[PDB]
Scaffold this active site. Structure first.
Site, PDB file in Angstrom:
ATOM      1  N   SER A 131      48.401  32.625  40.667  1.00  0.00           N
ATOM      2  CA  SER A 131      49.766  33.160  40.690  1.00  0.00           C
ATOM      3  C   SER A 131      50.789  32.027  40.730  1.00  0.00           C
ATOM      4  O   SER A 131      50.782  31.258  39.853  1.00  0.00           O
ATOM      5  CB  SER A 131      49.925  34.208  41.799  1.00  0.00           C
ATOM      6  OG  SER A 131      50.926  35.141  41.430  1.00  0.00           O
ATOM      7  N   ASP A 177      47.539  43.738  36.023  1.00  0.00           N
ATOM      8  CA  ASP A 177      48.375  43.029  36.986  1.00  0.00           C
ATOM      9  C   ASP A 177      49.779  43.596  36.981  1.00  0.00           C
ATOM     10  O   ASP A 177      50.454  43.618  35.981  1.00  0.00           O
ATOM     11  CB  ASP A 177      48.362  41.557  36.551  1.00  0.00           C
ATOM     12  CG  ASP A 177      48.851  40.597  37.587  1.00  0.00           C
ATOM     13  OD1 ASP A 177      49.728  40.946  38.417  1.00  0.00           O
ATOM     14  OD2 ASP A 177      48.304  39.438  37.585  1.00  0.00           O
ATOM     15  N   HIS A 208      45.931  42.030  40.166  1.00  0.00           N
ATOM     16  CA  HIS A 208      46.402  40.648  40.304  1.00  0.00           C
ATOM     17  C   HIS A 208      45.398  39.764  41.025  1.00  0.00           C
ATOM     18  O   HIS A 208      45.453  38.545  40.781  1.00  0.00           O
ATOM     19  CB  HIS A 208      47.669  40.685  41.086  1.00  0.00           C
ATOM     20  CG  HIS A 208      48.383  39.368  41.219  1.00  0.00           C
ATOM     21  ND1 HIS A 208      48.796  38.588  40.170  1.00  0.00           N
ATOM     22  CD2 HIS A 208      48.809  38.755  42.355  1.00  0.00           C
ATOM     23  CE1 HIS A 208      49.448  37.523  40.643  1.00  0.00           C
ATOM     24  NE2 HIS A 208      49.429  37.599  41.960  1.00  0.00           N
TER      25      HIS A 208
END
Length: 264
Positions: A131, A177, A208
């Protein structure tokens, strides 16, 4: 210019939970330029290996990305997983910290009391992360083109223009996601890279967290992470097919690759 370690790979060996090397680990005593770290290393790789630094996402800690430590290290890498100085650090800061972690691995490599004394080839480094830590890995690659490979997962960055990156880059993406959606984050970032060897691997029905510790696709994602690092950090052309191939997996909802030769 190859740095081959270990036996000739197979799909089976790369999908297994561990490679050939025994792994040991330690916490870094006095982290320099990041919050905390764990170093994973092979005891017996039969030569110096490259180093990989891995960064979590916003709010997150080493546990989210820890599975990569033994997984990679067992195939012949020194891996440092970090916690950031603040869990709320942004991508640029995560990139600085990731690089600081690599610097500190190089320091330990020259420290006679360290368990990794003489184990690292400091000229061969890679970056990974989740991320914002994935965005940080892309920033690291953009700012440090001598890095040999990058393999972020579910990357988040307020910019998707990574067009200057020349470092071989594998983007793991998670189909469903909703934090960093594929069509606004991972795919634009992938399409922005025009100058490198690159790959896009979207995990079917992934949230995610689809490439984090405890995921259900560790065979496939571990295969591809290790293969990419071996091909590009080690210039090990035994891994060209595993690194560059469509893996023909029902766990993959979208596969794309450019400048990635299957040839060994």
């Amino acid at each position: 210019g190859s740095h081959m370690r270990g036996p000739n790979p197979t799909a089976a060996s790369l999908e297994a939970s561990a490679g050939p090397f025994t792994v040991r680990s330690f916490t870094v005593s006095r982290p320099s330029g990041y919050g905390a770290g764990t170093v994973y290393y092979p005891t017996n790789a039969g030569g110096t290996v490259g180093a990989i630094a891995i960064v979590p996402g916003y709010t997150a800690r080493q546990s989210s990305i820890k599975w990569w430590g033994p997984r990679l290290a067992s195939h012949g890498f020194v891996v440092i997983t970090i916690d950031t100085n603040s869990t709320l650090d942004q991508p640029s800061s995560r990139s600085s910290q990731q690089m600081a972690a690599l610097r500190q691995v190089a320091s330990l490599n020259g420290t006679s009391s360290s368990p990794i004394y003489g184990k690292v080839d400091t000229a061969r480094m890679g970056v990974m992360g989740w991320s914002m830590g994935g965005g940080g890995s892309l920033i690291s690659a953009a700012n440090n083109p001598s890095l040999k490979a990058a393999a972020p997962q579910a990357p988040w960055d307020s910019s998707t223009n990574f067009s200057s990156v020349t470092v071989p880059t594998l983007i793991f993406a998670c189909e469903n996601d909703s934090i960093a959606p594929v069509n606004s984050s991972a795919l634009p970032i992938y399409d922005s890279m025009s100058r490198n060897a690159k790959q896009f691997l979207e995990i079917n029905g992934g949230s995610h967290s689809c490439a984090n510790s405890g995921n259900s696709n560790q065979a496939l994602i571990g295969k591809k992470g290790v293969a990419w690092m071996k091909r590009f950090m080690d210039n090990d052309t035994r891994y060209s097919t595993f690194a560059c191939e469509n893996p023909n997996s029902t766990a993959v909802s979208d596969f794309r690759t450019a400048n990635c030769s299957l040839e060994d």
